[PDB]
Amino acid sequence: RTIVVTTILESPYVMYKKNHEQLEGNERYEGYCVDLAYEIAKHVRIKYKLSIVGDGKYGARDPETKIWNGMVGELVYGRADIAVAPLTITLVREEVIDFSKPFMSLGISIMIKKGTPIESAEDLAKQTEIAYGTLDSGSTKEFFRRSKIAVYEKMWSYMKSAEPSVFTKTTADGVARVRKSKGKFAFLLESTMNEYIEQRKPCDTMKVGGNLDSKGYGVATPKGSALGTPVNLAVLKLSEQGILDKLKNKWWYDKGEC
Amino acid sequence: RTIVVTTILESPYVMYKKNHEQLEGNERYEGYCVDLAYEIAKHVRIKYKLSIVGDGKYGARDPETKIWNGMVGELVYGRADIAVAPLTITLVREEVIDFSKPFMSLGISIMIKKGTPIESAEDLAKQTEIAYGTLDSGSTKEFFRRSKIAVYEKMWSYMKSAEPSVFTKTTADGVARVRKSKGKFAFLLESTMNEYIEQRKPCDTMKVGGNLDSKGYGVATPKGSALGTPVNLAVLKLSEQGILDKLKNKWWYDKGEC
Numbered sequence: 001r002t003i004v005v006t007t008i009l010e011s012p013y014v015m016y017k018k019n020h021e022q023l024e025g026n027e028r029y030e031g032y033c034v035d036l037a038y039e040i041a042k043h044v045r046i047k048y049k050l051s052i053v054g055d056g057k058y059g060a061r062d063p064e065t066k067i068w069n070g071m072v073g074e075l076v077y078g079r080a081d082i083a084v085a086p087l088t089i090t091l092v093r094e095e096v097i098d099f100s101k102p103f104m105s106l107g108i109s110i111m112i113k114k115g116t117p118i119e120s121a122e123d124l125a126k127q128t129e130i131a132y133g134t135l136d137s138g139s140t141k142e143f144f145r146r147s148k149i150a151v152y153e154k155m156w157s158y159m160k161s162a163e164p165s166v167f168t169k170t171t172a173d174g175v176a177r178v179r180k181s182k183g184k185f186a187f188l189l190e191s192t193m194n195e196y197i198e199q200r201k202p203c204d205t206m207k208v209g210g211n212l213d214s215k216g217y218g219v220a221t222p223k224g225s226a227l228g229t230p231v232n233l234a235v236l237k238l239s240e241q242g243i244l245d246k247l248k249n250k251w252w253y254d255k256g257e258c
Numbered sequence: 259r260t261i262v263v264t265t266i267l268e269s270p271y272v273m274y275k276k277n278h279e280q281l282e283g284n285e286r287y288e289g290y291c292v293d294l295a296y297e298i299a300k301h302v303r304i305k306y307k308l309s310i311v312g313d314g315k316y317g318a319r320d321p322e323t324k325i326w327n328g329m330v331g332e333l334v335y336g337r338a339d340i341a342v343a344p345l346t347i348t349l350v351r352e353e354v355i356d357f358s359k360p361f362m363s364l365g366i367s368i369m370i371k372k373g374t375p376i377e378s379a380e381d382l383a384k385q386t387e388i389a390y391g392t393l394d395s396g397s398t399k400e401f402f403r404r405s406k407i408a409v410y411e412k413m414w415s416y417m418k419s420a421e422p423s424v425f426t427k428t429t430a431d432g433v434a435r436v437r438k439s440k441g442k443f444a445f446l447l448e449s450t451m452n453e454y455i456e457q458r459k460p461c462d463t464m465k466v467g468g469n470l471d472s473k474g475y476g477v478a479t480p481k482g483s484a485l486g487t488p489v490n491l492a493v494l495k496l497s498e499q500g501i502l503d504k505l506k507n508k509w510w511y512d513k514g515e516c
């Protein structure tokens with residue numbers, strides 16, 4: 001009866017409230033996805049419990065062990081009824097889970113430290129003085145592993161074999177490494193996170209270029225779940241009433257410290 | 259065995275080839291959607307026949323007669339197996355047909371004649387000297403009919419009752435009326451068309467402002483069609499290989515005459 005909503009700690013989507021550690025259940029969290037889960041549950045009329053995924057990963061299938069980890073895995077093996085998160089709608093995932101139409105548009109972007117002499121993906125691919133990496137084990141990393149485009153083929157070639165590891169267990173680790181690297185590390189991350197950080201102190205980073213691709217986040221359910229339909233109509237409705245567009249403004253630009 | 263693909267005459271999506279009238283079948287057409295239909299059929303492995311919808315409408319349900327017209331209607335009553343077109347993924351439609359994940363992102367934008375003193379939706383709503391309208395009987399018109407947002411409520415109020423009719427049987431009629439109106443008519447149309455025109459002679463129009471909303475075009479099939487799944491995976495695949503992104507460039511920016 002109570003729906004398990006799997007989710008991940010990623011700002012500004014799901015974040016601990018100023019005084020969690022002092023609260024319980026869904027009270028402990030806040031963010032875009034928290035508000036979104038709340039809206040969806042209201043229109044779908046369910047009680048739900050937010051659960052932060054254990055391994056803190058998004059979802060990939062190990063090639064040797066064939067097992068799905070992360071949020072996707074929680075759905076695939078039934079431990080979660082629905083994931084509300086910045087979960088990218090990719091082809092491999094859609095074969096094993098279900099996705100609503102996107103609730104947010106985005107694309108892979110480049111985040112530099114202010115004053116870095118990089119404007120584009122080519123600017124980065126045609127040099128070695130500035131290191132650059134991506135979040136680990138996610139759709140951004142995969143974008144490059146798979147690309148058949150010259151420049152992205154160049155980039156994946158550099159990153160795939162870079163010492164130390166240019167990937168990062170987390171978004172914050174990439175951001176941190178951009179801030180601490182005196183303009184000698186560009187981070188490749190999804191435009192939405194990039195845009196969020198750009199409005200946070202010490203306001204020393206910035207989005208350069210246009211996006212490398214296009215894609216969306218979907219609310220995801222297990223393949224064949226009875227919840228799939230209501231959930232999709234719910235997201236579309238929130239879209240049509242401007243809600244998503246009201247929620248984006250709130251967590252990105254009103255929280256803006258610059 | 260041969261799949262009927264319903265479609266509409268809308269540039270640059272589906273357009274007559276320089277010397278149709280002299281050709282037959284799918285040969286008569288070209289455009290983004292023609293290339294897209296072709297790609298999809300290749301991965302789904304079907305022979306198909308392109309059909310331009312009779313009434314030249316997108317799809318709405320008459321309130322008195324309860325009947326669906328346009329491309330949607332062709333799917334709903336089985337005369338078409340799949341629509342490949344600039345068909346907006348809206349809530350009311352998704353209740354009766356099926357939609358792939360979006361193959362293109364867009365939003366309602368404002369198209370002025372160069373030099374018009376309008377930058378935004380508020381700029382337009384706070385005056386009466388410049389008329390402004392929308393395509394008729396489509397999701398853009400509906401966006402305003404439904405909006406609960408002050409400024410859009412103002413705008414729909416003006417348009418709903420404007421003499422002569424500010425709506426337009428067609429995109430081209432709106433564009434034409436913008437070009438012939440000496441900066442006394444702004445056209446409200448989807449960003450993608452707006453962007454296309456902006457790069458066409460006599461290059462006397464331009465997109466002003468940001469978009470009023472967000473949404474996508476989906477490839478649509480009848481509700482429950484066995485084709486729904488293959489089609490969705492196909493669109494996602496084309497996305498991941500950069501195809502859609504190769505096709506956008508081709509019909510928008512390489513055809514560019516400015």
Ligand SMILES: N[C@@H](Cn1cc(F)c(=O)[nH]c1=O)C(=O)O
Binds near residue numbers: 086137
């Ligand atoms: N949403 C992603 C995960 N994810 C998040 C990021 F912020 C990012 O830069 N890259 C990435 O893959 C996908 O679902 O794996």
Ligand SMILES: N[C@@H](Cn1cc(F)c(=O)[nH]c1=O)C(=O)O
Binds near residue numbers: 344346347395396
């Ligand atoms: N794609 C639309 C139709 N459509 C097209 C336009 F170019 C436009 O400006 N407005 C609109 O509603 C929907 O599916 O009705």
Ligand SMILES: [Zn+2]
Binds near residue numbers: 016021
């Ligand atoms: Zn804490």
Ligand SMILES: [Zn+2]
Binds near residue numbers: 274279
């Ligand atoms: Zn002709």
